Amino acid sequence: SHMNTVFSNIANAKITEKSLNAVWMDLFKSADEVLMATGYVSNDAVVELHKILELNDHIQKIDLLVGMHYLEGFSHLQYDSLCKLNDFLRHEKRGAVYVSPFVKFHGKMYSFKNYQKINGLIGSANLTCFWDSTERTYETMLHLNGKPAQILQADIQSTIHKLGKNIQEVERPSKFIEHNSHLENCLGVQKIAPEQIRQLFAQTSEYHFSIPAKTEEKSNLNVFFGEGRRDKRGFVKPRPWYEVELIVSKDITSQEGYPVLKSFTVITDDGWQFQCKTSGDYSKNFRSENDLKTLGKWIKGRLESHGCLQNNEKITHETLREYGNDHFELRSTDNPDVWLLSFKGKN
Amino acid sequence: SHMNTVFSNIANAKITEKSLNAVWMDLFKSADEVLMATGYVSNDAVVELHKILELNDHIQKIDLLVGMHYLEGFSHLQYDSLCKLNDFLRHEKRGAVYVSPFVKFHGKMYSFKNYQKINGLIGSANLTCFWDSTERTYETMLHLNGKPAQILQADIQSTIHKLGKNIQEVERPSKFIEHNSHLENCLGVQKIAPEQIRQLFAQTSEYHFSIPAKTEEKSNLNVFFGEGRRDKRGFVKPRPWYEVELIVSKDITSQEGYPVLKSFTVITDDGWQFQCKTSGDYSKNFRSENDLKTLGKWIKGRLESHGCLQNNEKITHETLREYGNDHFELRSTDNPDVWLLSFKGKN
């Protein structure tokens, strides 16, 4: 009773009464102090947590132990985002980010302090965008309340004291693991071998469109910098880092052969397959269909991998210039339901 | 209470009363039925679990869900080991191995039944050689007994029923990911960049020894096939797959410059650094000092990555012939405490 199983409950495998992301967010929203211990983190999870703490004053203290990365390997984007979060927390005296220099720490544990009420979660789930309602992996946690949660809270605190070192206080890693956007973890995404891609892109297309990468500061590709959504309790959530809005002008959607108001398969020059869909006024909105984030991860992830885009940064005319491309190429195949999409850099 | 936190308690961070590997083994040893759900597995963990069930009759039923690999990627060795385990379980009517074809299942959950008494673990730890007393990562679990353990057991059962498909019943994976021995997860191992290695091995050595890869069937490199360890109760553990005994003849250790009865740094042709140690009569025994398994993982993992050695297989001279090498090269540097160790195949 002081214990409840809490699973992801996706994929027609609804096992537990409540689902992970909703429970985590519920506990996070009402808490005034949080302890987090994770094995891994992603750049967007960290950057978005950072904005969330910027946008909501409810968390008075937050401590985050990142356990695996110091010894196993950081991307520069992960490392810098954590440093940047730490800077904020320190300057606002709202807590700290720790790494684990003495051991590869793999635990996933969360404690939420609401006044005198304590809730805990412990299981498989690393720190992700729990504030994204789309769950992509099936995780299993155990929710604790009352006195057992109190015990877990102290054990998390002990972990931080004995294993954790303020990330500010450690030597910045000499070598980084290269940035991996992990597009394969987006829902509805397949990898296509380079040989298939070569043969598939060899063909000549009947229809060919060149769609501008837009450079608006707070919308389109940069909606991340636009206004966040406020929930009923007043919690403000930023728009996701890997969400873009690809909005195609009438000048193009009106052209012969354009896939208007249609679902279709897209295959990318760098070997990814996923369903997209056009919709809205003048069929302007071009979207990845199974996962909101696929299209944005494809676009921003490529920019990030070339070193043209980093944390918390707007795509500008200069981003595209340095990358070597300012358009997305959308062209047909002999199949009216399969299209090719390219965003090749100068390399 | 019906709950206890159970952590690894390594790296001078002893936080919980009992430590993970010891608790898991204790519960495993007392059980007549086990339910296991994991995100990941390694080839040796599966092969050794398989050997454990071969050697001990106490487990009447075991169900094993492997959650991540089917959709994310199998190595041939992981896939083959699980299939062989399933084959055994099917033939003995002692349970089954499941994969997760419909979702990337990442949970880590274990349920142990002793008569009618149920014990459970839920947290961060994937299936490893829990029967190896050395923990290499700091993991965090929550132990359940009584009615809460009963609940977790039912939820594990549901997970298997809703997500699991018998590995016998799924299409063989189209592509395998390359075998990764993950030597970096051995204690006391550092990685050296290919550029430094190239410069380091360019030097000429004053001392040069060529150490035969021995082909004894049940000892030396093949101690895995030797006798296992029996504890007080008669529970049999096989000798670890990645344990080898590198035994060097008097003809070699008696030679000028051989590192007798001393610890020294070893750097390998494929970019790994770790301390080794010579000991015993005539400095006969050559060992990884910080982690018993490093040397065997280095030697066998290379044979495995080339496809010259497979699951549950003894190293023979034909293994070595197919590989293209039957000797380990140990030669000096200008530092008498730093040595070069090579095992290149024809490749």
A:B CB pairs within 8 Å: 139
User: Contact A148/B11, CB-based, under 8 Å?
Assistant: no
Domains of chain A, CATH where assigned: 1-185 (3.30.870.10), 187-347 (no CATH)
User: Contact B104/A136, CB-based, under 8 Å?
Assistant: yes
User: Contact A13/B37, CB-based, under 8 Å?
Assistant: no
Return the DSSP state at A347: -
> Is B134 within 8 Å of chain A by CB?
no
Q: Report in angstroms the alpha-carbon separations of A82 from A94, A100, A102, A323.
A: 14, 13, 19, 26
- Tokens representing B126 are 């994937």
User: What residues are paired with B172 via a beta bridge?
Assistant: none
Nearest-5° Cα angle at B6, B1 to B11 = 145
Token pair 């035994």 is found at B247
Yes or no: say if B235 and B307 are a contact pair by the CB < 8 Å rule: no
Residue B246, C-beta contacts closer than 8 angstroms, at least 6 positions apart: B211, B220, B221, B285, B286, B287, B295, B299, B328
Token pair 């729990």 is found at A130
- C-alpha A128/C-alpha A45 separation (Å) is 5
- Tokens representing B17 are 């009363």
> Is B103 within 8 Å of chain A by CB?
yes
Question: How do B263-268 and B338-342 pair as beta strands?
Answer: parallel
**Of chain B residues 17-56, which have a CB less than 8 A from chain A?**
37, 39
Q: How many CB atoms lie within 10 A of CB A208?
A: 13
- C-alpha B45/C-alpha B47 separation (Å) is 6
- Tokens representing B183 are 């030597």
User: What is the experimental resolution, given in Å to one decimal place?
Assistant: 2.2
Nearest-5° Cα angle at A190, A187 to A193 = 160
- Tokens representing A197 are 């891609």
- C-alpha B199/C-alpha A160 separation (Å) is 41
Of B12, B163, B193, the CB nearest to A162: B12
> Is B164 within 8 Å of chain A by CB?
no
- Tokens representing A192 are 């296509």
- Tell which of B100, B106, B126, B160 to mutate to test the A interface (max A CBs under 10 Å): B106
> Is A152 within 8 Å of chain B by CB?
yes
For the four alpha carbons of A69, A74, A78 and A82, in that order, the dihedral sign comes to positive
- C-alpha B276/C-alpha B182 separation (Å) is 18
Return the DSSP state at A345: -
> Is B158 within 8 Å of chain A by CB?
yes
Nearest-5° Cα angle at B162, B121 to B110 = 10
Yes or no: say if B13 and A103 are a contact pair by the CB < 8 Å rule: yes
Shortest alpha-carbon distance between residue A107 and chain B (Å):
5
Yes or no: say if B226 and B303 are a contact pair by the CB < 8 Å rule: no
- C-alpha B43/C-alpha B33 separation (Å) is 23
- C-alpha A188/C-alpha A232 separation (Å) is 31
Yes or no: say if B147 and B154 are a contact pair by the CB < 8 Å rule: no
Q: Residue A246: which of A277, A282, A284, A292 has the closest Cα?
A: A284
Concatenated DSSP letters of A7-37:
E---TT---SSSBHHHHHHHHHHH-SEEEEE
User: Contact B155/A7, CB-based, under 8 Å?
Assistant: yes
Helix, strand, or coil (residue B212) = strand
- C-alpha A68/C-alpha A98 separation (Å) is 11
Solved with: X-ray
Concatenated DSSP letters of B215-227:
--SSSGGGGGGSP
Residue A281, C-beta contacts closer than 8 angstroms, at least 6 positions apart: none
Token pair 């003894």 is found at B314
Nearest CA in chain A to B155: A15
- C-alpha A228/C-alpha A236 separation (Å) is 6
User: What residues are paired with A4 via a beta bridge?
Assistant: A143
Concatenated DSSP letters of A206-223:
S-EEEEE----SSSGGGG
Q: Residue B136: which of B182, B170, B78 has the closest Cα?
A: B182
User: Contact A159/B16, CB-based, under 8 Å?
Assistant: no
Helix, strand, or coil (residue B248) = coil
Of B13, B106, B152, the CB nearest to A162: B13
User: Contact B155/A122, CB-based, under 8 Å?
Assistant: no
Give the orientation angle of helix A76-92 with respect to helix A43-55, to 10 degrees. 20
Concatenated DSSP letters of B64-131:
EEE-SHHHH---HHHHHHHHHHHHHHHHHTSEEEEE-SSS-B---EEEEEETTEEEEEEES--S--TT
Yes or no: say if B101 and B69 are a contact pair by the CB < 8 Å rule: no
User: What residues are paired with A166 via a beta bridge?
Assistant: A98
Residue B318, C-beta contacts closer than 8 angstroms, at least 6 positions apart: none
